[PDB]
Write an enzyme that holds these catalytic residues in place. Sequence first.
Site, mmCIF file in Angstrom:
data_model
loop_
_atom_site.group_PDB
_atom_site.id
_atom_site.type_symbol
_atom_site.label_atom_id
_atom_site.label_comp_id
_atom_site.label_asym_id
_atom_site.label_seq_id
_atom_site.Cartn_x
_atom_site.Cartn_y
_atom_site.Cartn_z
ATOM 1 N N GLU B 49 0.816 -1.116 0.000
ATOM 2 C CA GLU B 49 0.000 0.000 0.000
ATOM 3 C C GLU B 49 0.914 1.250 0.000
ATOM 4 O O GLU B 49 1.924 1.374 0.853
ATOM 5 C CB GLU B 49 -0.912 -0.219 1.225
ATOM 6 C CG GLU B 49 -2.129 0.572 1.209
ATOM 7 C CD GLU B 49 -3.098 -0.039 0.171
ATOM 8 O OE1 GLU B 49 -3.096 -1.254 -0.096
ATOM 9 O OE2 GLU B 49 -3.873 0.796 -0.369
ATOM 10 N N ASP B 60 -4.911 11.761 7.941
ATOM 11 C CA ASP B 60 -3.616 11.388 8.500
ATOM 12 C C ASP B 60 -3.084 12.171 9.752
ATOM 13 O O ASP B 60 -3.370 13.463 9.967
ATOM 14 C CB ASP B 60 -2.587 11.618 7.390
ATOM 15 C CG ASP B 60 -2.673 10.535 6.211
ATOM 16 O OD1 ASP B 60 -2.491 9.238 6.404
ATOM 17 O OD2 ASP B 60 -2.814 10.859 4.962
ATOM 18 N N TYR B 175 -10.934 -2.328 3.381
ATOM 19 C CA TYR B 175 -10.096 -1.682 4.418
ATOM 20 C C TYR B 175 -10.860 -1.608 5.779
ATOM 21 O O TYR B 175 -11.796 -0.739 5.957
ATOM 22 C CB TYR B 175 -9.632 -0.242 3.991
ATOM 23 C CG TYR B 175 -8.392 0.274 4.739
ATOM 24 C CD1 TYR B 175 -8.406 0.563 6.143
ATOM 25 C CD2 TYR B 175 -7.193 0.357 4.073
ATOM 26 C CE1 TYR B 175 -7.205 1.064 6.827
ATOM 27 C CE2 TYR B 175 -6.054 0.796 4.785
ATOM 28 C CZ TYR B 175 -6.072 1.091 6.099
ATOM 29 O OH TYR B 175 -4.922 1.451 6.755
HETATM 30 C C1 LIG Z 1 -0.694 4.645 7.491
HETATM 31 C C2 LIG Z 1 -1.725 3.502 7.517
HETATM 32 C C3 LIG Z 1 -2.550 3.685 6.268
HETATM 33 C C4 LIG Z 1 -2.540 3.541 8.777
HETATM 34 N N1 LIG Z 1 -3.144 4.846 9.101
HETATM 35 C C5 LIG Z 1 -4.502 4.642 9.075
HETATM 36 O O1 LIG Z 1 -4.960 3.391 9.048
HETATM 37 C C6 LIG Z 1 -5.534 5.741 8.997
HETATM 38 C C7 LIG Z 1 -5.597 6.569 7.740
HETATM 39 C C8 LIG Z 1 -5.242 7.885 7.726
HETATM 40 N N2 LIG Z 1 -5.457 8.289 6.438
HETATM 41 C C9 LIG Z 1 -5.835 7.255 5.694
HETATM 42 C C10 LIG Z 1 -6.093 7.192 4.331
HETATM 43 C C11 LIG Z 1 -6.462 5.937 3.793
HETATM 44 C C12 LIG Z 1 -6.572 4.821 4.673
HETATM 45 C C13 LIG Z 1 -6.269 4.890 6.045
HETATM 46 C C14 LIG Z 1 -5.880 6.121 6.511
HETATM 47 C C15 LIG Z 1 -1.520 3.449 9.879
HETATM 48 O O2 LIG Z 1 -0.477 2.585 9.750
HETATM 49 O O3 LIG Z 1 -1.708 4.160 11.054
#
Ligand SMILES: CC(C)[C@H](NC(=O)Cc1c[nH]c2ccccc12)C(=O)O
Lengths: 253, 253, 380, 380
Positions: B49, B60, B175
């Site tokens: 990913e 984020d 997801y």
């Molecule tokens: C970085 C990874 C994707 C995970 N962050 C999130 O799941 C939460 C999040 C914040 N913005 C996002 C956009 C898409 C999916 C999940 C997202 C993490 O490892 O903490």
Amino acid sequence: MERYENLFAQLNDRREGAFVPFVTLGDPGIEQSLKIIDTLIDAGADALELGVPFSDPLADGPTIQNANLRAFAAGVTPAQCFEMLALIREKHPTIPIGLLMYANLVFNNGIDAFYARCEQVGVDSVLVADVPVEESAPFRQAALRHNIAPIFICPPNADDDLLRQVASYGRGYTYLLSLHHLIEKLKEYHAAPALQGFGISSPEQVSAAVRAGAAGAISGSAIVKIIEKNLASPKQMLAELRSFVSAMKAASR
Amino acid sequence: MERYENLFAQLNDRREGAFVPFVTLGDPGIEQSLKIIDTLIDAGADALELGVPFSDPLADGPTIQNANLRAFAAGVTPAQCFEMLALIREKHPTIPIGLLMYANLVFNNGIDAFYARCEQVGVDSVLVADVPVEESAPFRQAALRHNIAPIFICPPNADDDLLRQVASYGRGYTYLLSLHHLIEKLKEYHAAPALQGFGISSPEQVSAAVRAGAAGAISGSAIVKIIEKNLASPKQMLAELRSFVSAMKAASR
Amino acid sequence: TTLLNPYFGEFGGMYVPQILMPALNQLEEAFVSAQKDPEFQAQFADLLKNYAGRPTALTKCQNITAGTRTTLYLKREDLLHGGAHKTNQVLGQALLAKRMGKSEIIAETGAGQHGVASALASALLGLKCRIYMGAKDVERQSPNVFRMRLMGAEVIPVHSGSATLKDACNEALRDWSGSYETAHYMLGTAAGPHPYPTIVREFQRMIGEETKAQILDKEGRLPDAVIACVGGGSNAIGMFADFINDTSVGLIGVEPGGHRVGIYFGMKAPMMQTADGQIEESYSISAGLDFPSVGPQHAYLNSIGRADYVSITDDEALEAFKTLCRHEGIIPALESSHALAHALKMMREQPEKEQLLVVNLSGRGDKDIFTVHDILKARG
Amino acid sequence: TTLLNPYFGEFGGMYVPQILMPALNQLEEAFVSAQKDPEFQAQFADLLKNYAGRPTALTKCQNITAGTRTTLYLKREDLLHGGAHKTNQVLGQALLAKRMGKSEIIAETGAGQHGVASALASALLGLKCRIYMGAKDVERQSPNVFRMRLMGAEVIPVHSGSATLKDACNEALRDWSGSYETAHYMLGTAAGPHPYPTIVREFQRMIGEETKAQILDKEGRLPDAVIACVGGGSNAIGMFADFINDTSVGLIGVEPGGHRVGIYFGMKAPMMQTADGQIEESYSISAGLDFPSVGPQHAYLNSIGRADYVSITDDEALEAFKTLCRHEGIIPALESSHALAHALKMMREQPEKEQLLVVNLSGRGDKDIFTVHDILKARG
Ligand SMILES: CC(C)[C@H](NC(=O)Cc1c[nH]c2ccccc12)C(=O)O
Ligand SMILES: CC(C)[C@H](NC(=O)Cc1c[nH]c2ccccc12)C(=O)O
Ligand SMILES: *Cc1c(COP(=O)(O)O)cnc(C)c1O
Ligand SMILES: *Cc1c(COP(=O)(O)O)cnc(C)c1O
């Protein structure tokens, strides 16, 4: 005492007007002020007009404003002002002495009592500049109980009712603020002899005043500028006052 | 292409879950990013990913926030991002590649056109994080016309109507945002296999995800912290990623 | 003579040089005229309402009085155009200046609040405006000076004397003595020579008027007390006047506590002065309450018992300031915070007395935020 | 689904992560409820009138239009509690927060004006308030920060990213995603995801409502045009809304001229952005008009012709600012000075056209005096 009457009867016997300088008591110091005043008299002043340092002189402009400053700076109180008045009289028994004052100082320890103190040091008149005739009763009454002449300003914007009150209530002299007709009206009502004040700084203006019928002229900014200009040469300052006074007084014939 | 189907059929044949790391493309530089990604795969990542640097990543937090910064600093454009995508594919023909994107970048040059560009470089899915299912039609439609799987987030605050839409519209994977029951419901509606994401940073959490029924786990902050912590020792950073990935992937059995 | 009595009992009068008597008689005569001219009424009304924003709000303050038996309302003069009650009376005096065919306004100002007010009134009515200000006050009030000049006023920094209000004010009188045919002297408070204490009260009296109707509509009865801060006394007399004849209504004037009769500023009144009689300067956290004296109508009302006057210190004023911002979201002028501090002590010292209180919130406190900031940071 | 259409033609929508959809659906449902609840109406009304000071004045400006055939009125939102129109809608949103049993407000703010508004509303209604602000904006807006904190708000300086609004605003959303059961996100303009463009318009619509009654009373006819400045578009939509169905009334939106469609801030709207699609930052002398985008209802009204949108430069804005202080004695906010500058160009470019114009004076300019001073002195 009747010192204004006597000075005017005398000067009339000589077909002369009065020349009367004004200074701020204690400027630029107590002792230098005494010497200045004595010089004025010696040079021919016919009467004196004196001011007492006051925190808010609303009827005053700049040369004057700066004399009060110099006064408060050298540490002059009202008390010192009266001792000075006392010794000026002890030195000169007949010259009329006139004060120009503001109301809060005459009201502070008692109106009655301010005029008792003037009579004890030998003051002949008091003009309270921010007291109009309409509100002057307690001051005129006090003055007269202590043999002090209450003075009034007759403005250029005077109307008839005004001259009549002025004639009727003032004694010793009338203060004619910088005019012929006003002078005639005053005489027609038997007002105290008019002295013209404000703006008198050259011999021709004293003659013009006498010629118009005024019994004389009061000169204050011109005197005081001679003192300002000369703070560092007391000798010359005195020399200057003497020529100035002498000439102004010559122009009163 | 059907790379998600194939990876899940395979891992099921081995009774394994998927371990899927996330990084920001170009962090901390273009070339170091490529080496990092290749290390991830080599260490046992089952899919990737990937994020594209975007001025306002509202979905984020911080380690991540700082990776985007490092990205914009090294001068990474979207264009460079796609060339990178292209070569990552040219290097690894079967691993599913998934993007995590925000809407303005997919909308900018045409929705249709963003999904044409992903299909040309060999991307398998796109999740648009700030597009809820209720507004996803034009993105899902575009994705599918270009053989790209549209991904949806199934939140913890999901209700029934939500799971049903998610099941019905997503393809490749679901997801599952950091759960057992939600996992059963998803399967009951035949949703794309769930990957659990957010907060996965230790082997026990990957096992817990597989045990609960998730088809695997996505780890992004943990990876990215290893990169932050190690900016000055590329060798060690790579060594760290390799041990980390290898262990997380072991825990997927 | 005059048409109206220039004194309130023994206080008041017209202690100015003879040369300014015709200017005072002219103003008194014109005000007396205007008070009986419907057209002048309608015109002052129009400015008030469509320009300054009257009537102003009367707000209740339950978050402050919770748990006690007081109900407190604030009369919102801080929402007037300009942020203070001064805008009321400078509008009325500017219209009078026009009725007397004057084309010019002269004023004086200390911290600048009256100066801004006089300037906005002159800009509206098409008057030239010259404002006198002590040079020391000028260096420290840069924002206000600049606001005067944006509004087309000439600000003259006065360099002589102590270069403070004293001197500004004495210079303004001397200009008015030569120009009274074409210029009007706009005094900033309910003090000075007649006819001003009178003029100013009747130009500020819509305050208590409004408050009286508002309180009758909301509560069905008059207040137990009306509370206002006092510098020269204009906001307070303007809140008190309509209630004077309502004998059950308490009238409380609040003077600055910071950390005798005389004749000055044209009037006979109680004054701050030395032993020898030179007028001193009053000190307060709030520059707006520094007035060595007080209007003669307040002196009279005290002599007879009809109103009481109390003091509040700087710290009590700052505490009420903090209380109002936090619990009502209103930032009050530090002058009006002395008034509110007194109503908070009345409430808190006697929390089970039933009392309906109105405080005059004379103006907003945006202008005090730097003062208050600098205090908070010099003490930790 | 939603109860109301989230789009204005093609603009608008709810472009947020799935996790915030239940919070938007909850707000929309509560607003829809409140709009039909007399008691909520009466309560919003009470705050407006007795707290904020509504109705506000509609002032005519003959000194400005002398010699032309224009008549100009200004709608006086600069006399509202707080000095700007923002106070209207933060009051309505704070009451909604209470109807949904929320105890906490979250907000973001650039120069601080929305931050002060959100804070005064929270202090009144008894809500805890947390305000996000970019650390660079925090160092330069010391007065506003301090005003927030006096009012009991916690201001959180945001140190990451560019440390500007962007980042403040993104942090506010993330807090709202975990706390939406007890906290309400109070957006500051008529933009963002549904239901906000809608909410905000109906909480600002008493403006044009009042203006319509006032103008009918004073002139006997509707205006030829209503003119308002546009950042995100709340004061303007609030002045335009009641006139939309009066087809003869011109609606002019004025954007900053300083010296394309996208999806951001939760909405589909025209945006300031780069080639590659990263949102840029708008620049203006007035910090209040720096909004990269504009509310979807304005985008719609333009697409169909019903309203026109024009620009005014910094200098034209400063000229109108000077004109109003000098000729009316009103110091206007620099945002609202862009609006007045456009009505002055309409008047001056066509001095014999008969036109009745209303300008929305969205707020007072005391807060801009330093900006304007620093400009005047950097140019002589
Ligand atoms: C970085 C990874 C994707 C995970 N962050 C999130 O799941 C939460 C999040 C914040 N913005 C996002 C956009 C898409 C999916 C999940 C997202 C993490 O490892 O903490
Ligand atoms: C100084 C002297 C008295 C004259 N000043 C005045 O006449 C005007 C004036 C100002 N204040 C006054 C008080 C009393 C009398 C005259 C006064 C002068 O010489 O200019
Ligand atoms: C001027 C001012 C005052 C004090 O003056 P007064 O004449 O007593 O009313 C009090 N409050 C405010 C806000 C002021 O502006
Ligand atoms: C906030 C503000 C604006 C701009 O915001 P909008 O949502 O467009 O109205 C304009 N004027 C003032 C005075 C402001 O405070």
